[PDB]
Design a protein around this ligand. Structure first.
Ligand SMILES: [Ca+2]
Ligand SMILES: [Ca+2]
Length: 608
């Protein structure tokens, strides 16, 4: 059988790679650093934190809130299994990472920021998370009473209520904070009944289904968190506003639970809360359609057994429905025959994602996993190209990709933003599915698993050429191809070492040597007079300081800065470049000159 504990371990770790903001020191990788620390600065608020949505760096709160709710749902249903796997703490930390962010986005009762970053502006740049905020502004978008967003506020209410539910025993004060914000956001959504102000997510996370399903979703979670029947009643109030399967009176059943349709999960929760036939029949009708069929109709299946609802995020849909199948099949009121059908269906969808069709569709897991997920920071280009490097510098452990077509066909290409898309909501229900599969079938996680990668290219270094000319003239490029993690540097300098024995032995003062910047792409570039390095051997160096100029792996030729400079003695003084340490290195290998060491804020970071 497949190792569900390892899969669960990695599916949860995936969210660490999506973290935005000032990162905790207990992350388990060496290739994510601080990012987007100025989020919210355009409106005078701290709106850092949360997750980047997909392979981009926009923070879309509707799918982010959906994700957090689903992860908390996994905790709620499968806490003990998650504890045993060793991953419950990390999952809870990720849930709180998102929820802390939602709370900051809600500075007053009827004002909610639902997006940080602009989709069109953000997606123009194929650069790592640690550099994206240098390339374009990241505006903060909000809804309020004059420009409302019932769908996203209700969605966030559900996330904070679900967070309160799972934290109320271990952190009563935080749960009380979450539940208050939840009820306020619910009232906000219910008061406005409109998405008129929810515009910044157009073409990315538009709500075609509206907010009535979200109101039942949020109401049910609020009730579960603190037992307020006022919100269960409101949740049931809006059931008759849910989508209806056309040509029938049935609650819609032929799609699936996802970020833009939560009435499937809402029906399941309301079923367990009230045991009412309406909800039990609705969810059974849905799960039947996905398994054995309903009234002569059944979801499409690939020849190799994948339930194939659509071509967009097909594995996201199959694994999420499987999760719901797990929850309902574990319920005592679920008819036994179909409890077995449902859980058998859930395992097969889990096993398809993990490799039953011949390859894994989970990055970094199993047999022949995808290697080119459509993900900027895991690829980690230093020059704003999907094609450079031609392989990902990092392994996005645990990422469930979009998946194959209805014939099980699939191509692993970074440019296929459909088959190789990855996203927060793709892994959300997946985590809960793997929790149940671990609870039932086991599979040992990797002990103390850490995503500490080997650095496969030199991050920061000088490339240089030189020519002798009554002294020396240097043409240098100071590179920042950092990757572990990518980072912006603005305090970089390097040293050029010389042996001035022939010069000082002839009676000349090193301070009369001319040092000059000829040209530099760094406007702050400066060069020091010779500095004594070894009084016994008359070794000196000149410091070329580019502090003040950003050098980072991004676009606009920012991953390198050219500096041309000259070091020339007074006319007539002896000069021998051939005994100069840095000159010798340049002529040995100008590509990477260890003999011109690089310093960041005065600390050596490369070279001898
Ligand atoms: Ca909706
Ligand atoms: Ca010399």
């Amino acid at each position: 059988d497949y190792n569900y504990g390892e899969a669960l371990q990695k599916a949860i770790m995936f969210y660490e790679f999506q973290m935005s903001g000032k990162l905790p020191d207990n992350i388990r990788n060496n290739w994510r650093g601080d990012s987007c620390l100025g989020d919210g600065s355009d409106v005078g608020l701290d709106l850092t934190g949360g997750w980047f949505d997909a392979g981009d760096h926009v923070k879309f709160n509707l799918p982010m809130a959906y994700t957090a709710t689903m992860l908390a749902w996994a905790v709620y249903e499968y806490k003990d299994a998650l504890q045993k796997s060793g991953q419950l703490g990390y999952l809870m930390d990720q849930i709180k990472w998102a929820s802390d962010y939602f709370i900051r986005c809600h500075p007053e009762k009827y004002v909610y920021y639902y997006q940080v970053g602009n989709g069109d502006m953000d997606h123009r740049w194929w650069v790592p998370a640690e550099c994206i905020d240098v390339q374009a502004p990241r505006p903060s978008y909000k809804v309020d009473l004059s420009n409302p967003g019932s769908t996203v506020t209700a969605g966030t209410a559900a996330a904070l209520a679900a967070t309160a539910l799972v934290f109320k025993d271990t952190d009563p004060a935080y749960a009380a904070l979450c539940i208050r914000h939840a009820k306020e956001l619910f009232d906000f959504a219910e008061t406005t009944m409109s998405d008129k102000g929810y515009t910044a997510a157009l073409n990315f996370y538009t709500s075609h289904s509206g907010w009535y399903d979200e109101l039942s979703w949020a109401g049910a979670w609020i009730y579960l968190a603190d037992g307020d029947e006022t919100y269960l009643e409101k949740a049931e109030k809006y059931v008759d506003k849910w989508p209806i399967e056309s040509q029938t009176t049935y609650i819609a059943y032929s799609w699936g639970h996802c970020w833009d349709d939560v009435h499937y999960g809402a029906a399941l929760l309301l079923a367990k809360i009230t045991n009412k036939s309406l909800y039990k029949e609705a969810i059974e009708r849905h799960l039947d359609y996905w398994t054995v069929g309903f009234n002569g109709q059944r979801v499409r299946y690939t020849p190799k057994g994948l339930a194939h609802l659509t071509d967009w995020g097909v594995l996201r849909h199959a694994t999420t429905t499987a999760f719901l199948a797990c929850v309902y099949s574990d319920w005592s009121e679920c008819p036994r025959e179909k409890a077995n059908i449902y859980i058998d269906f859930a395992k097969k969808q889990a096993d398809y994602a993990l490799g039953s069709s011949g390859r894994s569709y989970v990055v970094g897991f199993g047999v022949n996993p995808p290697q080119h997920p459509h993900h900027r920071t895991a690829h980690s280009s230093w020059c704003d190209s999907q094609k450079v490097p031609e392989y990902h510098r990092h392994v996005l452990y645990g990422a469930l990709v979009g998946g194959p077509d209805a014939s099980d066909a699939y191509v692993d290409d970074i440019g296929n933003y459909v088959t190789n898309e990855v996203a927060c909501d793709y892994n959300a229900g997946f985590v809960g599915l793997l929790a149940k599969m671990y609870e039932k079938y086991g599979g040992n996680p990797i002990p103390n698993f850490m995503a500490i990668e080997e650095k496969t290219n030199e991050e920061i270094y000088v490339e240089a050429t030189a020519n002798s000319n009554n002294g020396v003239e240097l043409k240098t490029y100071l590179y920042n191809k950092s990757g572990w993690p990518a980072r912006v540097c603005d305090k970089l300098s390097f040293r050029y070492f010389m042996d001035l024995t022939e010069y000082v032995s002839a009676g000349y003062n090193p301070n009369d040597i001319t040092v000059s910047i000829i040209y530099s792409a760094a406007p702050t570039a400066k060069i020091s007079k010779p500095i004594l390095y070894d009084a016994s051997k008359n070794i000196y160096y000149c410091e070329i300081d580019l502090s003040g100029t950003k050098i980072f792996p991004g676009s606009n030729s920012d991953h390198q800065k050219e500096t041309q400079f000259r070091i020339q003695p007074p006319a007539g003084a002896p000069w021998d470049n051939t005994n100069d340490f840095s000159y010798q290195g340049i002529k040995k290998n100008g590509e990477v000159v260890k003999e011109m060491p690089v310093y960041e804020d005065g600390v050596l970071i490369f070279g001898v």
